[PDB]
Amino acid sequence: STNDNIKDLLDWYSSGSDTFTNSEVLDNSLGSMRIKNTDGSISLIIFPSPYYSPAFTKGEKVDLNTKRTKKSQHTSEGTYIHFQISGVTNTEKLPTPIELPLKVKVHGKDSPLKYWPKFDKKQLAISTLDFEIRAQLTQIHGLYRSSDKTGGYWKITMNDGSTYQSDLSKKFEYNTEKPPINIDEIKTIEAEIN
Incomplete structure (x- = not known):
């Protein structure tokens, strides 16, 4: 339960x-x-x-x-x-749709992606990235469906080493959301389900 x-x-x-x-x-x-x-x-x-x-x-x-x-x-x-x-966000597009680098781990073990889409927009709001990541985790990796998959986090690491992260056991903090980011500047995105 x-x-x-x-x-x-x-x-x-x-x-x-x-x-x-x-x-x-x-x-x-x-x-x-x-x-x-x-x-x-x-x-x-x-x-x-x-x-x-x-x-x-x-x-x-x-x-x-x-x-x-x-x-x-x-x-x-x-x-x-x-x-x-x-x-x-603004309406600017990238020259070609890119595949965002998302690595997911469930209980320390790697969990392969399924139907992770491509994006052709230059900038995406962090809340958008949050729901895209969590949607993948809930539909494909069982996040929130059972008691053994109720927490963890996702972390976006930019090229300059700056980071954005969100706790999966809580709703996204809209009240402190930062401005949209250039998705082609994202080095890695990691998600771990405790």
Whole structure:
């Protein structure tokens, strides 16, 4: 059996994510943005971190690789609104999609990847990287599904030796999230399930 925190994490990381490309900024206030997606929908996205306060102005184009915080709403004006958190980046692409270096260990033993995708975007928010890594761990490596796979961490090491890491036994800390990173500058990504 697992505890309720682990159950919340399983529900959170096994639901998918929302992807929108070339959306347009309608408004940008403190802690949030109102964006119009190319399909007509509107996205209201919150940004709780002072370290990651998107500065895009009205009219600029952006990409969304985010998670919904609640069910979308059909409004009176007839507008479809999404409620999401974080995951807004510029629209720049890499010359060719790259394969991020992810090494996973379960109980000290190496665990081979399955369906780990390629990425063609120059920058990705750390929260996006967090849900992509954890999704792979939950779907393929059993993270959060049983009591013997409830913790560990993932660590991203950049070329300059700087690091980013997240504790798998807790939800990603959105309130202190750092700015998006250039994924081609990532040297290694390691994930260990205790």
